[PDB]
UniProtKB/Swiss-Prot annotation:
Function recorded in the entry: May modulate transcriptional activation by target nuclear receptors. Can act as transcriptional activator (in vitro).
Span of the entire protein shown here: 4 to 87 of 287
Protein's organism: Mus musculus (Mouse)
Subunit structure, as described in the record: Interacts with RRARA, PPARD and PPARG. Interacts with THRB, RARA, RARG and RXRA in the presence of bound ligand. Interacts with SCOC. Associates with the PI3K complex I (PI3KC3-C1); the direct binding partner in the complex is reported variably as PIK3R4 or ATG14.
Protein's name in the database: Nuclear receptor-binding factor 2
Subcellular location: Nucleus; Cytoplasm; Cytoplasmic vesicle, Autophagosome
């Protein structure tokens, strides 16, 4: 590959394909949709390492996973907040007259 004859070039790209979706959804306020997106990628990552009998390979996973989760927790919280906020800032409910 690049400055090295090793690397987990496989389960990494696949997980990346999903990441994008989650992002494109976040912008559209489709948090929920994104939330899952991460749940899948992560699940697949955790399994990858549970398959590879190499050390380095496992590392590239334990690292990529971190974020895959860091965003999940960030999005989730960013949702429960909007659920109440948005509903407030959004024109809805009872009116004056």
């Amino acid at each position: 590959g690049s400055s090295g004859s090793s690397g987990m070039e496989g389960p990494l790209n696949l997980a990346h394909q999903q990441s994008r979706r989650a992002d494109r959804l976040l912008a559209a306020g489709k948090y929920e949709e994104a939330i899952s997106c991460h749940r899948k990628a992560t699940t697949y990552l955790s399994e990858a390492m549970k398959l590879t009998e190499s050390e380095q390979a496992h590392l590239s996973l334990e690292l990529q996973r971190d974020s895959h989760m860091k965003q999940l927790l960030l999005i989730q919280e960013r949702w429960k907040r909007a659920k109440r906020e948005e509903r407030l800032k959004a024109h809805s409910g009872p009116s004056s007259g």
